[PDB]
Subunit: 451 residues, 3 copies
Amino acid sequence: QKPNIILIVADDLGYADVGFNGSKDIITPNIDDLAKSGTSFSDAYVAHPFSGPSRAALMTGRYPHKIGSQFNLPTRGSNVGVPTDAKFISKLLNENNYFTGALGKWHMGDTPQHHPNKRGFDEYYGFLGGGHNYFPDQYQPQYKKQKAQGLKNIFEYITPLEHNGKEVKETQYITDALSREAVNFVDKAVNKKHPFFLYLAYNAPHTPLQAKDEDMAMFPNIKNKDRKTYAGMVYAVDRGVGKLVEALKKNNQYDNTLIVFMSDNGGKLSKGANNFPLKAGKGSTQEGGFRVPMLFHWPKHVPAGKRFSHPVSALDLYPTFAALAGAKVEENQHLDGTNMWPAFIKNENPHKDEPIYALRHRKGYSDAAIRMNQWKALKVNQQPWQLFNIENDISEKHDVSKSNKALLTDMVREMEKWSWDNQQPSWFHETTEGVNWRLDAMPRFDKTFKT
Amino acid sequence: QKPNIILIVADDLGYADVGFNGSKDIITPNIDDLAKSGTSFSDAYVAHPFSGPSRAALMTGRYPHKIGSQFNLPTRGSNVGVPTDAKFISKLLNENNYFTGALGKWHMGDTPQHHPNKRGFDEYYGFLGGGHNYFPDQYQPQYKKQKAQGLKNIFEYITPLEHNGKEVKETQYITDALSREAVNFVDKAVNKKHPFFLYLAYNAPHTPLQAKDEDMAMFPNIKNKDRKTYAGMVYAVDRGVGKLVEALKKNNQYDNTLIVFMSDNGGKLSKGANNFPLKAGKGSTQEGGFRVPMLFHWPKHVPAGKRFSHPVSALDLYPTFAALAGAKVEENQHLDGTNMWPAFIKNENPHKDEPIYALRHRKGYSDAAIRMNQWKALKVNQQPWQLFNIENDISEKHDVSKSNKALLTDMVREMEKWSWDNQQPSWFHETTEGVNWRLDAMPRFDKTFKT
Amino acid sequence: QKPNIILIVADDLGYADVGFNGSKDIITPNIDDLAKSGTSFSDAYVAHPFSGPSRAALMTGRYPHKIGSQFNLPTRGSNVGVPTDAKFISKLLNENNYFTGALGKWHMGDTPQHHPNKRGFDEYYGFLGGGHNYFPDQYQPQYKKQKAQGLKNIFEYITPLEHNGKEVKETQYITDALSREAVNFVDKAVNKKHPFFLYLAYNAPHTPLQAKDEDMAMFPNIKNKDRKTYAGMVYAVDRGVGKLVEALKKNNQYDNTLIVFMSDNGGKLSKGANNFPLKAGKGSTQEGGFRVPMLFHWPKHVPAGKRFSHPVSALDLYPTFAALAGAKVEENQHLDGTNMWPAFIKNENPHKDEPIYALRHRKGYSDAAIRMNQWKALKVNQQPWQLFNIENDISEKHDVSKSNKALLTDMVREMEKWSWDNQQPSWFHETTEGVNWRLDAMPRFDKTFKT
Ligand SMILES: O=S(=O)(O)O[C@@H]1[C@H](O)[C@@H](O)[C@H](O[C@@H]2[C@@H]3OC[C@H]2O[C@H](O[C@@H]2[C@@H](O)[C@H](O[C@@H]4[C@@H]5OC[C@H]4O[C@H](O[C@@H]4[C@@H](O)[C@H](O)O[C@H](CO)[C@@H]4OS(=O)(=O)O)[C@@H]5O)O[C@H](CO)[C@@H]2OS(=O)(=O)O)[C@@H]3O)O[C@@H]1CO
Ligand SMILES: O=S(=O)(O)O[C@@H]1[C@H](O)[C@@H](O)[C@H](O[C@@H]2[C@@H]3OC[C@H]2O[C@H](O[C@@H]2[C@@H](O)[C@H](O[C@@H]4[C@@H]5OC[C@H]4O[C@H](O[C@@H]4[C@@H](O)[C@H](O)O[C@H](CO)[C@@H]4OS(=O)(=O)O)[C@@H]5O)O[C@H](CO)[C@@H]2OS(=O)(=O)O)[C@@H]3O)O[C@@H]1CO
Ligand SMILES: O=S(=O)(O)O[C@@H]1[C@H](O)[C@@H](O)[C@H](O[C@@H]2[C@@H]3OC[C@H]2O[C@H](O[C@@H]2[C@@H](O)[C@H](O[C@@H]4[C@@H]5OC[C@H]4O[C@H](O)[C@@H]5O)O[C@H](CO)[C@@H]2OS(=O)(=O)O)[C@@H]3O)O[C@@H]1CO
Ligand SMILES: NC(=[NH2+])NCCC[C@H](N)C(=O)O
Ligand SMILES: [Ca+2]
Ligand SMILES: [Ca+2]
Ligand SMILES: [Ca+2]
Ligand SMILES: [Cl-]
């Protein structure tokens, strides 16, 4: 009965950089097959416009602000991570008889208690930090040189990958390696006789921009060097997905597996991405920062060849997966999303008359976003709040706040109300950021929620 | 054996605005009956000079500073409240076989976990915020208009009352409605065969100043408009108390019930109150802010026709009620008051040689108060500490700090010692207040405890 | 089988002020006997360069920064202390069948929950604060005068000593009294038939500088008044140790007891100490502040007549004692030291390629220290980081940072990484210190970890 679940998350994948979500230049046949025989989502949102807090939200089902995880972890390492008392969806599923696997990027804490194996994943194969260099032939010599020199703070992008806490010596381009271990994970799952949960966290197409020549060779008409490199990186993810689907079919897992494919946040335009038709990109509270491609694939359950047009949150995956797995959630987990399945099946808005938030901190102020029904409220760059009918003005060109004053004020005040149980950040991505936070009396919600 | 307990709390009731505590113009016959056949308290103190933290202290038996509840909750709503790990007196009594009821004003959190029904009250009938408009005929149309317009942040003074989480349509003037449900609560209690605890939290005579014509008609010689309205509001509370006593007598509950009547803080002089002979009023650390009327009534147990002249704290009610109920308290609850009954029965000071504190935060500084034996230390308006022999100088006219230097310094240093386990505020009543707190490096206890 | 353990800690004992660690003027025959038949440590470090946080670290096995105890407790008293959820080594040993005793200075909280008897000591005889006056004849009349005057905030240096919460009337010079009760403790231990742990926390030679004439008489060639007084104070500790060893031999405990003797921090040069050949003293992150004398004595187990030359931390005592006692440690205790015994027995560095830290907060900035293998990194007085080859430059005269840039930067970045799970201080030693902390947006780790 109970389905296997695969959550595939690309890292900094631009909105228009898969074929099912409008790519004209990058070609993603295998990812598009899953979209063509499943349902894609035109209004899918992550809980934060960059990696660490977005991933924290995927795993915990909570806005990262509620659990002190509003910032990326310190870039040079730390002994902190996403709080251990917020149960990960993997742990919940593992407690309900799932064989659990995590692959690739973690970015949620690298201490013993924060490690994938202590957050409910039986299997982990990957790198624990914010990304990685893609070619072992490049990074392994650099790590050797630095380690032999006696350095202990070695940049996490060149450190060896690990398998369940034991270091390995990777031989393949990282995207191919993660795809290979996805196949290995689902092949191991055959014998288990319970259902499985796989969290596949590709670092592609996140920087550094490094692609195989064989992949870049498939895009001879992309003349921009970065865009061709980026295209090659995305194509490697597509090959990977193809290799995984192959294995699922061989093992007779394909038909009873829910596959979710998405990005952790918007594309970085200066590093090869395209977020058309959305404004801006990674880190923004404009749509381009936190509105992402998403597809569901599960034959006979997810309708084939459809596009779901109502708002869905990455926060919804926790209770949705939980309900589909027959795993009970507790009220004291304070889940911020909803089980979207009943509304999804009726082609209705699972967040009818309810807001979806983004709140991204900057130096001495915060940018914010509110999506509810047709409306997108926007607080950016210390401008006054703006309002867009996002259903007809997806690119956020036509501020209609002047003619909907009471509605806008109401949305902002509800966000203000929501903000009070946000915890003080438990860390920042740089030491100076934490010092500035304190110096600036943050959060400056007097500015953020001013109407 | 074990007595029923009723805690009646008026909201912003002035010190001289009941007959038993010296009113010459407002007439409160039923409240005065309870005083005449019981004991009133000339030196009764609440733990904070305004609502939210005072109520937090009544329920938890802790100074609100110890539990992060030094401020009123955000006026436009929030998902925060008085910490769930500080057990409410209602919860303790409920755990020891009491049928528990709360009526009227809450002001201690409106989330599911902070709701009266989750803080140990079997029955709740009231409004969860800081107050309410008094006439359904006035507020219900306003709420209809706003709700039909699609507004979600609706001012809590016009929102519908509820009964155990289900919304109701109130038909009576709020003070009469709460009195009616007090009767209903004690009538329900007859069948239960356990003792009962009723927390009756009238919003009268708190703003808005709104009275029935029939009540105002009883004060033809009060020419000041606000004072007449206020008098009418207090008279409605007296009628209510009378209606409740009536029901207690009918049910044979009267003789074995401990009735406590008090205010949550001092009267607001600009909104109809009189705190004679005390200086200042609501929010002050002068006596007028946190010294309140109080009576106990319990035939054969509380002496009849007496006035107890020693300091008593609202903090004492938790362990006193607990002891009278045979409910065990634990050392790790960190109760800040004392079981006052043994000293009360011997007509001795239950806080002999021990301080009672007030500490009220302002913009960039704090006002403070210390009551111990005959002495009142006062820190106000960024003036140097003052000292009064409050037994001979109740109006705080004669600063004798110059001639008791060592005593004053000693009292202040003991308060400074007490301040270290005060928690940072978990919320503020406005966003800007919290920003100013952070900007001003609060608490500025270098100013507050300077000698 | 399992050994008794005695941890003797002098308070502000200078580096060169015992004979085994190079004293030419102070003579410490009994302490030197333990060194001569045991192993002394040339590179022994406490976790903080002053009392409260150093002691917190000894007892918890954690850097005090991890548990909010980076500052001394408020000098005029408080209701805070070292967190009750960090299990004390005494509690652990008590749970593993040890008879436990603490003597003399506590300085880790004086509330019921923070009291020695609630932190795993069966016996406590001493004073709970930061120090004490040494002559009962002097302090007892002062305390009587103040107590009879009705003062409640009485300076903790004159308050009566206590035995398990009950006040006593001490008749001897405090150092002699503590020594006497050490004898009484080990005599009580004879009957118990389990092993024992004694924590002997002398306040000597900490201020006030007060010595017996009979002790000062032994140093006729010390002409400096303070140095002679200080010498006499240290000699009283030596007599005490001699009296204790006497009792251990009488009771047949000597041979199966591990005796550790050390200081809580470096000597205060302006109050009689000598830290030769180390730079600076008490409170500094120069070697003189946190590098201390230390000896182990345990016949047949600790080699006799040796000097161990590798870094050892006071943090190591918790897991080392635990392992020697057969007491299990849990991963979730987050111990910061190591069981040094296996490396110690092989004459190898128990902190090979691993740092030992000091981080001491000042007004608006922090001083820091890193010891790893031959290297000492130093951050002091808001100067740029310095680096010394501490093995050939113990006095920190020759900054070689210019020629080891990459190593120094790497060490600092590793400290920066370590800093993220440091908690905000739960208290300060003065109210103004806490206000300045907040005003200065502390910690200013942007300055501290700048390279
Ligand atoms: O004032 S501050 O607060 O401190 O900082 C600025 C601003 O105020 C911040 O609020 C803002 O926030 C950003 C968001 O959260 C943290 C900030 O950056 C995040 O995105 C990260 C992404 O930019 C980064 O990409 C890096 C580049 O490629 C990989 C990463 O490291 C590389 O550089 C290294 C180099 O340092 C080393 O010495 O040599 C290496 C050689 O291989 C390498 O160079 S390279 O490989 O040739 O490129 C590049 O800079 O990745 C991180 C994750 O690791 C973040 O991505 S993600 O995880 O968020 O998806 C957010 O956008 O930042 C302001 C300035 O930091
Ligand atoms: O500027 S700040 O830093 O943010 O704060 C200032 C200062 O620094 C603070 O120390 C000080 O603290 C005060 C104390 O705690 C919070 C502050 O106010 C508290 O008292 C509250 C009480 O004033 C308030 O009364 C209001 C008036 O009557 C009812 C309440 O709302 C009314 O107005 C509404 C109106 O806004 C709405 O649009 O229409 C309604 C219907 O027309 C209604 O109008 S009405 O017809 O007049 O009723 C009035 O303004 O009630 C709250 C509880 O609900 C507090 O009372 S109590 O719970 O504490 O007993 C404390 O004194 O605040 C400074 C800035 O105010
Ligand atoms: O208040 S501040 O302006 O913030 O303090 C400043 C600095 O900013 C701050 O960093 C520094 O911190 C000192 C450090 O920790 C607290 C401060 O004092 C400690 O040492 C103490 C001894 O000096 C004190 O000795 C006193 C002396 O003899 C006995 C004591 O009282 C007598 O009256 C006499 O003055 O004893 C303390 C323990 O009781 C403590 O000693 S301990 O070994 O640390 O316990 C330490 O250096 O303080 C600056 C100004 O004070
Ligand atoms: N396991 C040990 N304790 N080894 C250290 C040497 C022990 C040896 N008996 C000695 O006293 O020198
Ligand atoms: Ca990303
Ligand atoms: Ca009030
Ligand atoms: Ca010391
Ligand atoms: Cl710190």
